[PDB]
Structure formats: C-alpha cells, structure tokens
C-alpha cells in the first residue's frame, strides 16, 4: 500500500509492485505560469495529453564496474514525439516532470543506485589534468541527448562537487533488496517564468551506483536500468519556424 503503485498520465500507464513512495521535489507540484509571474504577452499553447505523457527514452546496462550516467532536461526530449515538436517551433517553454527510473533484479542480486535531480547541472572539465588548461566541455557532453552520458569522475560529479552531499537534492535510491524503481516529481525550476528548451537545461538527472552490483555466477548478469519520464503542465509560447538548436 506504498510498495505498489500506478502512474497514469496521457495514454500511458506505469506500474510497479516494489516501489518506495514518491518524492515531490522541493515539496511542490508542477503548476502553470501565473498571469503575474508571466512576462511574455502572447497567449500560450498547452497541448495537454499529446505531450504530458510517458516517454521511455533509454536503457543502460548496470555492470559491476559501471560509473554512473546523467541526462539533461529537457534536452532528452527535444527530438521526441509531439513534445519535441512544440519545443522546436516555440521559443519559450516551461514544464515539470515525472521521472520513473526502472531496475529490477532478483532476491539474490545486490546493489544500490542513487537517483537524484540536480538543477542547473553545469559540467566541468579536468583542465588538462594539471589544471593549467582552461578547457570546456563539448556540446555533446553538456547536452548528451537521450543516450545520456557516462560520468568520468562520479566522486566529484564531473563538476568539483562531492557526490556524498548529492542527497540534498530531490532523490531516491534503488536498493535491489528493497525496491525496483525511483519516482521523482519535479516542478519548473528557473529564475525566469519561461525559457528555451534548446539553449537551457533546467536540471540533470543522475543515476549512480554507490553500492556496486553483485551476484554469484549463474544468476542473470544483464541488469538494465530504464529511463521513463513525463512532462507535466507543459506550456509553450513564441511561435515561429521549427529550430533544432
């Protein structure tokens, strides 16, 4: 009665029989932009069900040596379904998200992933190793798209900050002996009421194994982690031709 759950939105329904409750980031639900916070004057389009549904974008394989991955929002969806289309024809976009990371195993496997949401996840480089070179991450590393991107130095989140303190961000854990998924709901986070779904990534999703995957020889070794997400309260404005970047 808390281990079992069902998420239905749009024409998509998700189930789980081993849940660990739901986190509502920063203790707040996605809402539409108010007439007093708003600044742009054009009447927005709120496509509803065609874009506020569950998109299942990726699957990574968890290995005894995996480092961890991250995806950027809304970058992951800008080229998918009706949502991607609206994000392209419009300058302005705002929305919330319901994230559902899935990973099941067996009662004989073990391991724990940390699933967190980090607003304004700015990536850094190793500065030529020595730290004397002012290098910067390439577009494909900052907006990895749907395939996400593997962390090079998980301990400092590839940004000079301790992953040990990452729990200060909305999160959940997928500890195999306990659950098989994390569900986090995120409201719009920005200093503006609207923004470009192309130039700016409001937050990054991180999935990092903190307690390594393990099992005896003979148990299924292919342990996938799948990413499913649904935009919520999607609003768009500033219409023109489609643009991909």
């Amino acid at each position: 009665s808390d281990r079992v759950a069902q998420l239905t939105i749009g024409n998509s329904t998700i189930t789980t029989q081993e849940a660990a409750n739901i986190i509502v980031g920063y203790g707040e639900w996605p809402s539409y932009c108010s007439d007093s916070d708003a600044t742009a004057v054009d009447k927005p389009t709120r496509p509803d069900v065609s874009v506020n549904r569950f998109y299942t974008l990726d699957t990574k394989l968890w290995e005894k040596s995996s480092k961890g991955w991250y995806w950027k929002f809304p970058d992951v969806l800008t080229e998918t379904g009706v949502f991607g289309q609206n994000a392209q024809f419009h300058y302005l976009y705002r929305s919330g998200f319901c994230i559902h990371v899935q990973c099941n195993a067996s009662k004989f496997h073990q391991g724990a992933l940390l699933v967190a949401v980090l607003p304004e996840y700015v990536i850094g480089t190793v500065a030529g190793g020595t730290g004397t070179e002012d290098t910067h991450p390439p577009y494909k590393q900052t907006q990895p798209g749907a395939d996400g991107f593997e962390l090079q130095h998980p301990y400092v989140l590839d940004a000079g900050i301790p992953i040990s303190q990452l729990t200060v961000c909305p999160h959940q854990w997928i500890n195999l002996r306990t659950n098989n998924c994390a569900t986090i709901i995120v409201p719009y986070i920005n200093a503006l009421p609207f923004d470009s779904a192309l130039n700016h990534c409001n937050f990054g999703l991180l999935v990092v194994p903190i307690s390594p995957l393990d099992y005896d020889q003979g148990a299924t070794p292919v342990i996938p982690i799948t990413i499913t997400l649904a935009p919520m309260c999607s609003e768009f404005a500033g219409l023109r031709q489609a643009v991909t970047q």
């Binding site: 600044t39 024809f89 503006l192 500033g238 023109r240 031709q241 643009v243």
Partner: protein, 242 residues
C-alpha cells in the same frame, strides 16, 4: 559636544547622491512660472511617438542620406519575393538608431515592452498591392522564403485609402527585461527579426510610376518601460568644444 562616530563613505562625492547642500542666495524668490505648452513629465511619453525608422540604412554619401528615410517596392515576378529585413532590437546598432525611441533607449541599460512599426505607402493612388510583414521571435534564423517567414507573427497589408498599417512586435521574451543586445553573448537579449514580403504584387495601370516608396515609423506600446539609467554609447565631441 554630542557623541558621533564617522562611518565609511564619509567625504565621498557620489554623483547620484540626492542630498541637501547650502543655498547661496538666501531669501531669493525665482521668476514665476507662466504657462508653457508642451510640458513633458516622463521620457516614456516620448517613447510612444513614432519617428522615422531608417530601414534603408545603406547610402552614406552626404547627398543620399535622405534616401535612408524610405525604401522601395515595385512590380515583381510573383514569386513572393523578399522586400526588406531588419532586426527588431531597438537598442542595437542599425535602423533603430534613427528613431528617438532608440536614442532614449541608449540612456538605459534595460527595457521591457512591445513595439510597433507603422508603414505608410507613398505610391500613387492607382497602385495596389498586398504585403506580408513578419516578426520572427528569437531562435528562428532569417526566413529563407516567404513560407518560412509566415510561420511567425505576421500581418498581411492591403493597400487602399488607409495608407498605413501597423506591425506590432509583441513582447516575447524569456526574461522580464532585456539588456541592449549586441553580437556575442548579449545576443541572448535579441528581440528577433522583421521581414517584408510581396504577398501578391505591386500592380499599377498604364501611366503610373512602377516604383514607389514606403516610410516606416516606429514607437513603443504602452507596456513599455526602461530601467537602470546609464550614459549613452555616443559622445558627440572630438576635442574640446570652444
């Protein structure tokens, strides 16, 4: 002696400090103020008056400067040809510098609001035509053709007794205010583009000129405001003014 303690700032002369300072002429009463027409109270009053936009900012020889004040239209080949384009950025280098709006805009760091450009057709009375004028919000590059241009905010102008038409450039921004846009990172604050296309064609009967001009007037809408008073980019002085 009443105990006081001096704090940092003491003795500084801040040019914008609004203070009190000794009157040099005690009991002096100024000449009274008679009525004078045209008193202005706020610069925004002036930002709503249309002034000429130099869309045709190409000629530079002294004898052709008057030509920047108007651009042409003429009979075409019916391919929805492009007539002219320009950036909507009011505080940016370009056509807007000819307008008082753009000028006053230079004395402020940030602005917010909708803009309007009214086009007046000055052809003969026998000339007809329909034009498609489009505002292309940020992110969309210069429309390659009229079909692309059409997906943005636009107005279709029909020539008739009403010589003019108004294109509203609605405030469509992510931020509440925009700083002056210029090449580089500040292109972030760009407003977008305006493109003018032939919707049909400039048609005229026998005996009327095949070329006519359009004059563009621009100003700001009533939701328009400015913030952060700064010095303008131009200083109209070379050496000492004698």
């Amino acid at each position: 002696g009443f105990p006081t303690e001096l704090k940092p700032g003491t003795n500084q002369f801040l040019t914008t400090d609004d203070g009190v300072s000794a009157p040099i002429l005690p009991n002096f009463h100024p000449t009274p103020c008679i009525h004078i027409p045209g008193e202005v109270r706020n610069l925004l009053e002036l930002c709503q008056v249309e002034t000429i936009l130099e869309v045709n900012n190409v000629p530079t020889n002294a004898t052709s400067l008057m030509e920047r004040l108007r651009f042409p239209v003429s009979a075409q080949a019916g391919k929805g040809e492009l007539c002219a384009v320009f950036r909507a950025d009011p505080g940016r280098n370009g056509p807007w510098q000819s307008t008082l709006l753009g000028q006053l805009c230079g004395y402020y760091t940030q602005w917010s609001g909708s803009l309007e450009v009214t086009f007046m057709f000055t052809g003969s009375f026998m000339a007809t035509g329909k034009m498609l004028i489009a505002y292309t919000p940020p992110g969309g590059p210069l429309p390659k053709d009229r079909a692309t241009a059409m997906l943005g905010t636009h107005v279709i102008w029909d020539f008739g007794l009403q010589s003019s038409v108004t294109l509203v450039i609605p405030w469509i921004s992510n931020t509440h205010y925009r700083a002056h846009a210029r090449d580089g990172v500040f292109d972030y604050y760009t407003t977008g583009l305006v493109s003018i296309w032939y919707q049909t064609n400039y048609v005229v009967p026998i005996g009327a000129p095949n070329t006519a001009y359009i004059i563009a007037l621009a100003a700001a809408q009533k939701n328009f405001t400015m913030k952060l008073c700064k010095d303008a980019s131009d200083i109209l002085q070379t050496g000492t003014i004698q």
